[PDB]
Scaffold this active site. Structure first.
Site, PDB file in Angstrom:
ATOM      1  N   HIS A 226       0.833  -1.202   0.000  1.00 41.26           N
ATOM      2  CA  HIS A 226       0.000   0.000   0.000  1.00 41.26           C
ATOM      3  C   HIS A 226       0.871   1.256   0.000  1.00 41.26           C
ATOM      4  O   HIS A 226       0.694   2.159  -0.832  1.00 41.26           O
ATOM      5  CB  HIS A 226      -0.938  -0.054   1.218  1.00 41.26           C
ATOM      6  CG  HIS A 226      -1.745   1.185   1.428  1.00 41.26           C
ATOM      7  ND1 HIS A 226      -3.106   1.234   1.222  1.00 41.26           N
ATOM      8  CD2 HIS A 226      -1.382   2.416   1.855  1.00 41.26           C
ATOM      9  CE1 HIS A 226      -3.543   2.453   1.488  1.00 41.26           C
ATOM     10  NE2 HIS A 226      -2.515   3.196   1.861  1.00 41.26           N
ATOM     11  N   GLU A 227       1.839   1.325   0.917  1.00 36.37           N
ATOM     12  CA  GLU A 227       2.725   2.483   0.938  1.00 36.37           C
ATOM     13  C   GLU A 227       3.563   2.558  -0.339  1.00 36.37           C
ATOM     14  O   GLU A 227       3.817   3.654  -0.859  1.00 36.37           O
ATOM     15  CB  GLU A 227       3.604   2.466   2.192  1.00 36.37           C
ATOM     16  CG  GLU A 227       2.843   2.475   3.530  1.00 36.37           C
ATOM     17  CD  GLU A 227       1.768   3.558   3.631  1.00 36.37           C
ATOM     18  OE1 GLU A 227       1.993   4.688   3.160  1.00 36.37           O
ATOM     19  OE2 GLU A 227       0.689   3.284   4.199  1.00 36.37           O
ATOM     20  N   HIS A 230       1.729   4.446  -2.932  1.00 34.35           N
ATOM     21  CA  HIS A 230       1.910   5.884  -2.723  1.00 34.35           C
ATOM     22  C   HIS A 230       3.287   6.328  -3.231  1.00 34.35           C
ATOM     23  O   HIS A 230       3.418   7.379  -3.873  1.00 34.35           O
ATOM     24  CB  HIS A 230       1.808   6.290  -1.241  1.00 34.35           C
ATOM     25  CG  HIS A 230       0.443   6.180  -0.625  1.00 34.35           C
ATOM     26  ND1 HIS A 230      -0.693   6.738  -1.174  1.00 34.35           N
ATOM     27  CD2 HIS A 230       0.063   5.655   0.562  1.00 34.35           C
ATOM     28  CE1 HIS A 230      -1.725   6.498  -0.382  1.00 34.35           C
ATOM     29  NE2 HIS A 230      -1.292   5.855   0.686  1.00 34.35           N
ATOM     30  N   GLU A 265      -6.012   8.128  -1.339  1.00 37.40           N
ATOM     31  CA  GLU A 265      -6.242   6.889  -0.608  1.00 37.40           C
ATOM     32  C   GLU A 265      -7.285   6.024  -1.306  1.00 37.40           C
ATOM     33  O   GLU A 265      -7.147   4.801  -1.345  1.00 37.40           O
ATOM     34  CB  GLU A 265      -6.638   7.168   0.845  1.00 37.40           C
ATOM     35  CG  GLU A 265      -5.514   7.780   1.721  1.00 37.40           C
ATOM     36  CD  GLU A 265      -4.302   6.834   1.974  1.00 37.40           C
ATOM     37  OE1 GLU A 265      -4.314   5.664   1.558  1.00 37.40           O
ATOM     38  OE2 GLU A 265      -3.298   7.236   2.594  1.00 37.40           O
ATOM     39  N   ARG A 359      -9.462  -5.733   3.978  1.00 39.10           N
ATOM     40  CA  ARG A 359     -10.802  -5.244   4.268  1.00 39.10           C
ATOM     41  C   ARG A 359     -11.468  -4.678   3.010  1.00 39.10           C
ATOM     42  O   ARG A 359     -10.819  -4.390   2.001  1.00 39.10           O
ATOM     43  CB  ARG A 359     -10.722  -4.178   5.358  1.00 39.10           C
ATOM     44  CG  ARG A 359      -9.969  -2.923   4.936  1.00 39.10           C
ATOM     45  CD  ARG A 359      -9.654  -2.062   6.138  1.00 39.10           C
ATOM     46  NE  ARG A 359      -9.021  -0.799   5.771  1.00 39.10           N
ATOM     47  CZ  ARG A 359      -7.722  -0.637   5.520  1.00 39.10           C
ATOM     48  NH1 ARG A 359      -6.872  -1.662   5.575  1.00 39.10           N
ATOM     49  NH2 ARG A 359      -7.276   0.571   5.194  1.00 39.10           N
TER      50      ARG A 359
HETATM   51 ZN   LIG Z   1      -2.484   5.207   2.292  1.00 38.65          ZN
END
Ligand SMILES: [Zn+2]
Length: 413
Positions: A226-227, A230, A265, A359
């Site tokens: 996830h990071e 980004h 996000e 999730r």
């Molecule tokens: Zn994030």
């Protein structure tokens, strides 16, 4: 093919892969006197620094906050990661998570993309020339020995030891197409659980319908990926942090609203919530990036008169046509690459490829207390399968169930 460099924390300085690094944010007053910090080059242009992230306004104080806490599921400990043993454990954990990411083609390609996608340098005397937006300084005895290329520096967590975040170094290059070095604060051992419906767990006999919400821990490889998404946006200079997506209207707005989410996000997490983005929004995002890149090609790239290695790397990063002094954006190839990094590369899609449960929505419905897990124990967490180890009967997400013995409770006051 891509290799991950292994290290122990006590490996000696060599000026090649093991350095003492001056903080990228060293010029900010809050960071005066900090460092340098031992740093390890795990992949070309990717460095691990086993220190707490404390280099921005919101991370400078590692104590329990002096104002109303942001997250009801935060955990604080200013002393975490201040001993050599904790630093080596952290180093080993990040290396193991990176080995896990590299074990599938989609993760290997993500790491290769971060390694190769340098920010667009400034031009000096006709040549692309490095700045602190693309390098870190090896500092020894108050002297700078060398400036080494870096696209990403991975640190330990900030004040909340179970939180993870990405910080771009320079705020205009993060969004104008140039790109910027990124820092990540990452916690491989302290994880925030989530709820998801599931049916394969020990259940009371008097419950008729077994498929209900259950608690799970995340795979920290998904958290890091996830990071890393980004980071990829930051390296391409396409980040979207001032925009909010309003779920009630389906429109982008420039301030937070009642039922909204930062658009950066929304995209980075992916999943169901990105499946109904309007064509208007997508076209606007693409046009903004195309315009930024067209401007950089004419105003910067076409001023290059010196063919050096940095120009080779930039041509691999940015699809162009034409010759020196007269490059043009390769529109079709740029659009394909942009749409991949914005709309295909995301946590939810990557997790599916790794058989990791994530999730349903980026925003969680309720906080769950963080847990500790020693992911260095291969009986609990393997590089090939994470927690969902088939030989132990824990495939199909069962190894992420929070009741598993390796998810250890933390008592907080
Ligand atoms: Zn994030």
């Amino acid at each position: 093919k891509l290799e991950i460099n292994k290290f122990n924390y006590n490996d000696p300085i060599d000026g090649i892969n093991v350095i003492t690094m001056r903080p990228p944010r060293h010029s900010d007053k809050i960071n005066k006197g900090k460092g340098p910090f031992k740093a390890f080059q795990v992949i070309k242009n990717i460095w691990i620094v086993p220190e707490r992230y404390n280099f921005t306004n919101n991370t400078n104080d590692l104590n329990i906050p002096s104002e109303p806490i942001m997250e009801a599921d935060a955990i604080y400990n200013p002393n975490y990661l201040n001993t050599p043993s904790e630093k080596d454990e952290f180093l080993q954990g990040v290396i193991k998570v990176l080995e896990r990411i590299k074990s599938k083609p989609e993760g290997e390609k993500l790491l290769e993309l971060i390694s190769s996608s340098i920010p667009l340098p400034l031009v000096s005397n006709g040549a692309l020339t490095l700045s602190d937006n693309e390098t870190i300084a090896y500092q020894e005895n108050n002297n700078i020995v060398s400036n080494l290329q870096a696209n990403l520096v991975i640190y330990g967590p900030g004040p909340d030891i179970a939180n993870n975040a990405t910080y771009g170094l320079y705020s205009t290059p993060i969004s104008n197409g140039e790109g910027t070095l990124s820092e990540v604060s990452f916690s491989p051992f302290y994880l925030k659980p989530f709820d998801e419906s599931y049916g394969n767990y020990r259940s009371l006999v008097n419950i008729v319908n077994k498929f209900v919400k259950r608690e799970f821990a995340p795979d920290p490889a998904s958290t890091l990926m996830h990071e890393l998404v980004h980071v990829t946006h930051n390296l391409y200079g396409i980040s979207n942090r001032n925009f909010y997506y309003n779920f009630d209207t389906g429109k982008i707005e420039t301030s937070r609203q009642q039922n909204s989410l930062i658009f950066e996000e929304l995209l980075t997490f992916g999943g169901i919530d990105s499946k109904a983005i309007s064509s208007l929004i997508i076209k606007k995002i693409i046009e903004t990036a195309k315009n930024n890149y067209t401007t950089l090609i004419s105003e910067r790239l076409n001023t290059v008169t010196v063919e050096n290695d940095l120009l080779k790397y930039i041509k691999n990063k940015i699809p162009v046509q034409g010759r020196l002094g007269n490059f043009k954006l390769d529109t079709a190839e740029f659009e394909k690459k942009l749409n991949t990094i914005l709309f295909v590369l995301n946590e939810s899609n990557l997790a599916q490829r790794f058989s990791i449960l994530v999730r349903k929505h980026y925003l969680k419905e309720r906080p769950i207390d963080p847990i500790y897990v020693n992911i260095l124990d291969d009986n609990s967490y393997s590089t090939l399968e994470g927690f969902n180890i088939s030989s132990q009967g824990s495939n199909d997400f069962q190894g992420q169930l929070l009741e598993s013995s390796y998810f250890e409770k933390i008592e907080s006051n």
